[model samples]
Target: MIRFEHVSKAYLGGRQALQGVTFHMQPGEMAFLTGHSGAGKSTLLKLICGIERPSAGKIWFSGHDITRLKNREVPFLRRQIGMIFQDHHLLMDRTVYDNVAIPLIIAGASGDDIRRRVSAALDKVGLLDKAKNFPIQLSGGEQQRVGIARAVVNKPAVLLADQPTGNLDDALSEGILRLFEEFNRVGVTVLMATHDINLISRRSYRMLTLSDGHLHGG
Candidate 1:
């Protein structure tokens, strides 16, 4: 469902983040992006999500050339991709329900639809009971699960997670991976950037390794 062709991303001052990266992901596949700090994992995800464009080469999603998508087209592209950050990035003042509902609200979904979708998403992350609580009231793992719920509330076709389990303990991290597995089983393509090779090695999924602005086999 996603492909990168000779993709090279160069940042300010001629610093190249990724060089000639080429890869393809089939629909419903789960993949792990692994590398050390300063590697191109984040750059790769940003290119796919349109946060930043590659300085050269091309990126395609389901046959659409995302490299040439205009600024006005980003929101539409993002609607089909869910992204999670190392930090949960939740609105502390909003309840869990409202936090997860923000995307639907921004998309102009109806109140009833938002309520139903948010509830289901939260339930998937095992956080439905905390719907009325705010981020400050939950533990780190709970807060992260709420973030996951928000990311998937729209049932996005692709999910990009950047160090999603970075702040959690082993048990919590396992739960998070299991959640991603369930989502992948239902056909949501997942690509996660992580340094946790020990954890990821135990799972059976495609692995893409990046180092010094180059991509190597998993």
Candidate 2:
């Protein structure tokens, strides 16, 4: 459902973030993005989400050419794609339920939709009981779960995570990875960027490796 054709991105001061990157992700595919610190993994993900414009070539998401998509249309496109970060990015003062409810609220979902969806998302992350708790009251892993819940609250078709387990221990990272696998089993396309070699070494998912802005080994 996502395709990149000879895409390249160059930032100000002549830094090339991506170069002739091309790949296709099928509707229900799951893959891991791997490379060194400045290998363009983040840039590729940003380009896919339209957070950064490409300097050349084309990008397609669900049949729409996002490379040519208007700024006003980015929000609509983002609704179908879920994003998770290494930082939980949870609001320190918001309750767990409120944090997960933010996406639906932005989408203008009704109260009933918000309530049902938020509950389901929290339940998926095994945090239903913590709905009333604040971010500061939870463990690091729990906080990350809250982040995962928020990202998937809208039932996005594509899930993108950038080093989601960067802050957690091995056991907790395994738990978080299992959550992604659960979603993928239900047919959510997942693309995650992680540098933890040990975390990915024992697994057998597709790997898209980037090196100095160029794509290699998908």
Number of the top-ranking candidate, with lDDT as the measure: 2
TM-score of 2: 0.90
lDDT of 2 by residue, 140-180 (tens): 87888889889988878999998888767898788789988
Instruction: Give the residue spans of candidate 1 off by over 4 A.
Output: none
Model 2's alpha-carbon lDDT is 0.88
Give TM-scores for every candidate, taking all chains together and pairing residue i with residue i: 0.91, 0.90
Can you write out model 1's per-residue Cα lDDT over 142-195, one digit (the tens) per residue? 887888888988878999998888768898789888988888899999999998
Q: In angstroms, how far off is 73's CA in candidate 2? A: 1.4
Best by TM-score: 1
Off by over 4 Å in 2: 136-139
Clashing pairs in 1: none
